[PDB]
Predict the 3D structure of the following.
Amino acid sequence: APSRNGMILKPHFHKDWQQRVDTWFNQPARKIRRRKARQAKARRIAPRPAS
Amino acid sequence: PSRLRKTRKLRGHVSHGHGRIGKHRKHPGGRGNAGGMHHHRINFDKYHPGYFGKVGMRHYHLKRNQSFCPTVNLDKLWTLVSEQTRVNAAKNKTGVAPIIDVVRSGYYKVLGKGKLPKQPVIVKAKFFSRRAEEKIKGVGGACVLVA
Amino acid sequence: TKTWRRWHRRVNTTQKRYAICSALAASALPALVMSKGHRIEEVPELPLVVE
Amino acid sequence: SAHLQWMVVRNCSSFLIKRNKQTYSTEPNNLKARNSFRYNGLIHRKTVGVEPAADGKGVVVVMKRRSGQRKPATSYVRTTINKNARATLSSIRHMIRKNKYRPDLRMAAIRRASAILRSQKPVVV
Amino acid sequence: VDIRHNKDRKVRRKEPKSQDIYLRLLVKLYRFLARRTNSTFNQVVLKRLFMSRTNRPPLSLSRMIRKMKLPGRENKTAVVVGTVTDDVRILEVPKLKVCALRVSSRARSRILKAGGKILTFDQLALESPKGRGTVLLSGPRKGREVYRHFGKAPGTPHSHTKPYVRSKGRKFERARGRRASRGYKN
Amino acid sequence: AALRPLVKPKIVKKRTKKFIRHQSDRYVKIKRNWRKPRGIDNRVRRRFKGQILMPNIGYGSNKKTKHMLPSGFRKFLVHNVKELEVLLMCNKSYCAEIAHNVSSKNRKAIVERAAQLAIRVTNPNARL
RNA sequence: AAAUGGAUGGCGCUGGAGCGUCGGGCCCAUACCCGGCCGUCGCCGGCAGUCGGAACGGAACGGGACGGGAGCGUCGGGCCCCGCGGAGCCUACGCCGCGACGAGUAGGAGGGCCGCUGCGGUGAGCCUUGAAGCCUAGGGCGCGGGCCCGGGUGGAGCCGC
RNA sequence: UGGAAUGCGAGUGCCUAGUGGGCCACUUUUGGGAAGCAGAACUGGCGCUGCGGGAUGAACCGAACGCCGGGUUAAAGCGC
RNA sequence: AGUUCAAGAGGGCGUGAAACCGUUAAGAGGUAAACGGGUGGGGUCCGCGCAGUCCGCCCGGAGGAUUCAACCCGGCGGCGUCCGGCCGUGCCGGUGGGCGGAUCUUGGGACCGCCCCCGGCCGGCGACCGGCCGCCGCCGGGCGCACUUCCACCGUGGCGG
């Protein structure tokens, strides 16, 4: 396995990781949803500082 | 880009660059770092001395936050204040000396690599090195300890 | 084929700003704009500014 | 600058034709229509173009004026020369040589004028 | 007949691997100068324009001041085929005439504030086509991290070369082979 | 009439026959398109006597007559009248071939325009 | 003395087509010499000098005395002329010159205007006056990967950079 | 007086695939009656290599290869 | 026979490859076929094939039409201490009132460094503009009305390619 100089690597891929993979393709969607929640909350408490 | 890779130029060659005699088998050696003491104990000794064995004493529940002590050398001490501060201080005739608060710039300990300009200065830090304190005094400054 | 293929690339902000400056500078040279097939004739000035 | 723009359009242009081992350029003021720094009709401060007249007789000679390099509308002065073949060649020769306006392109302009004048004379089988 | 062919093709750069058109224009300029002039300065500059970035290390402002303060170097132009970086450990900058491909913003400000002049290689050709009155400087070529790992192997007796180590600590390649109490120490 | 080139050199071909793939004669699945035989015991690869010849760079033609037609011209593919005008200043060494996808109406215009530009057409009678 | 019928290779050869020692001729290799063409490698190789004046081996200034002259004291001589004019060039990633060399499994590298499908630009691209696809004793190109055109069939899309 | 001859441009770094079954011959050589047997040394070769000759043949003799025209040879030949 | 543009679209029917087979045409045939290199014979197709070139200058013959050469008017270009506006470094005067600063404060201020603007001085045109004055070129018009200029034909014409 080892070939000349290198690093002794210990990857943690022994545990059926492909069943638990978190992709972030919904990341832009959750930014808009968080943003629209902030804007709706600010209107609902309109005079209050909304922060 | 798959069109810039070796597989494109390996079409038509029966062995895919892996040889006819030895072939490309699943795991001719072990898997991973297998045999580091038995059949790979030349690679491990030649390139990773110290890999096997135990050295030192354990320390349970290590919290790196209390061992936090960033360091700054004397050759970078005057970069923590503006250039105009050093020029005005040097041109001043009296014994007044500017203060560099090293902790304000995110450093706790002052080390003494380098040299200082002949310009007195008051340096505030949590810890000082022996040569750092001697060089600050030799220029005409003072070392002030801050908790 | 797997969904966790790297689809996205991040470019340095300085390089992205560099590319915009180069694109703007080239847009003011009529030879480069005609080399894009943009039919810039009878146009009074290539850096066209209107009110 | 001509050399700076040439390094941009050398292999990337809308006028570039690559086909069966030869290269051509179709910009309107390129004598010989070849992809070359010397003959490119867009990247120089002074270029010469020879085109057939609007009608079927004569040669229109295009010359780039010195000023307004960023003003495409007024960058080109066009002269219609409609006389006999020997006089047409002499006029194009004097415009390029007596003005010292791109003497590098003198023969190329003259050959292109002869091709256009020949193509206008009637074809008899 | 009866010859070897394994060393017939010399491996060297005959052009920059870069597609940067501005570097290609300086290569066009100095290709002409290396040919039509007997100057060996123009030949050396042409070679360094081809060279890769690892072979064109940045030149510190402090080191250029060091090398331009040597006797007889006054009123000469420091030529760097590379980047001139700023050194914050230097507090006084004299007046220098420096030609470089790139100069960092803080280095350029310090050089200009001192009264010096910064030139490009096209202005250097116009001022000194031969390369007269110049000091041809270079950054430290082996002053980068990969060279600490190169050479005689770490597990070999008199070797001081850095191993490839994932993390640094007491538990990472320090016991057997690095210590007489654990096997051996060469 | 028949437009002739500026020069008509004697074209010398080192080989007129096509290099055929090994055993393309024995199988229909093996097309005649050339493949270099990478076989440990292959005798075409080893250059035995009386076998199928392998192409190599020694067969390359003279650079003065490379890509030259028997008429002495070199062919340039053309799709419309405007592309034909690119051969105005190289009409004694280059000829125009109209693409197969050009319609019948457009071929008449290209042939008529090429006739008055002294540009030789390889295929002027197509789709007449 | 060995088993199918068989092997100076065979036929055959005995003033030799046998054995030994020798001569002079002559025949053949991808080897050697000369020449052509392709490529690779090398030459710190040449060309930005496109000029009708232009070019390698020194030029540029001012002081005195001088001789070859045009002049009859001027070294002015980038300005010249009964012609007003003189091919091509240099996609510098281009073009040109000279010299040497070229076997290849496993394997490595480079180039590919070799090929397939989709996307961003571009071709004022192609197409029911006929796209793709398929067939072809037709014309050709390229060392090759392959490609272009002619003809037939087909009926709606396709390709170049 | 660059301190023999001859020839040649050298030095150096990183990364690195395949391989890690070999076999044959002159000479030397161990075991074996011996072997187209087993095991060594040196060099060359086959394997990776086609070409002329040995009728045929991995290794012998000659000679190593881009596509061609002329000329000449090697080893070997010139009754058919 | 009819429908359809098309039945070479006829209800597992778009196009319709190969393997395999039938038939027609041509050729061949006792060392299984098939292959490489040379030729030769026959055949299908191809060549606006079947009296063979095409350009420039000059020489003659005869024809036609006139602008040319020069000169005048008008228009447009190209080039260069003459002037003005810019683009600017540096350099001073600030109505500046501006941004920052780990400089001093006696939040507001003062000080410093830059940024822009105003005025004066100061250098250069090329991805930066005008106006005089010349010199040169081109185009349009007039005059120039024929030993000039131009356009076509003929010679089995001469030179170069």
